[PDB]
Amino acid sequence: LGARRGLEWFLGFYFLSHIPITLLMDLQGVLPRDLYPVELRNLQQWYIEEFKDPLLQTPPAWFKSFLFCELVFQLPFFPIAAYAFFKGGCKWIRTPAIIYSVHTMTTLIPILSTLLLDDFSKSHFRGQGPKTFQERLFLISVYIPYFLIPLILLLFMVRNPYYK
């Protein structure tokens, strides 16, 4: 297969896998914890205590607004985009995918900037976040693919003549 067809397969698996990541992990900061079983509640508690995540446990107002945007705007677009790139040749996904890419990239620039430069001392984060530079890379590692893959998607829909 081609690099174009392979990238469409990758984008489909990215949009297909983003549905359980959002419903079962990300939305635990904006949706009540009662709706989640003790297994998933404690699984997110593992990531927060091991990766030293400051945002997921007690989301600030700016991070909660992005999680609601992920619920109302991104989650419905995931199955639509998954079908579009799994099937192939869906010219109608260009503008919707560009809007998703710029939106998602804009949400993670402040996320990556906070993890890399903000103060997580016993600050309004109250020592929840990372202290060392190595612990910050462990956190940026989980968040960075959700900026690069939309970046690839933005460049892919702007120039590909098969979607114009």
Next chain:
Amino acid sequence: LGARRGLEWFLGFYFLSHIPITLLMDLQGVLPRDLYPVELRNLQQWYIEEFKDPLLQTPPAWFKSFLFCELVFQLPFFPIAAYAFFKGGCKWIRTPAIIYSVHTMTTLIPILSTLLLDDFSKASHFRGQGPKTFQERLFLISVYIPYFLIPLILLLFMVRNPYY
């Protein structure tokens, strides 16, 4: 004048007016104070004192990241967009305007949510700097509202207009 050409003239002045607004006011939270004369530095303090803006006074990491994007991406795009909408028939601006609109519409959803839902008392990390009453919150939101609605008008205009 028609409806489409009238909206293009309105969009031209919006991008033209944002060049001094970004330069002489917003970028004072990222650029050194010595790059600005004493007169302009008090003009921003006059705004922070009267409108009680907690973000432009001392920018948090998430708000400062959006300001760096306004310098590297938005500011170079303003003179290009003003010319294209003043001249008319510049179909090459469709995708760049969509990218600007979605990006600008994503930076303010956290801003608008923070100014209306977050606490700015002395018990918070803002240390008592910011709006207190609901009227003071809408008085500050009023300044940031046009920069979410005007891009939204631009987004819907670029998507459906057959001339672009």
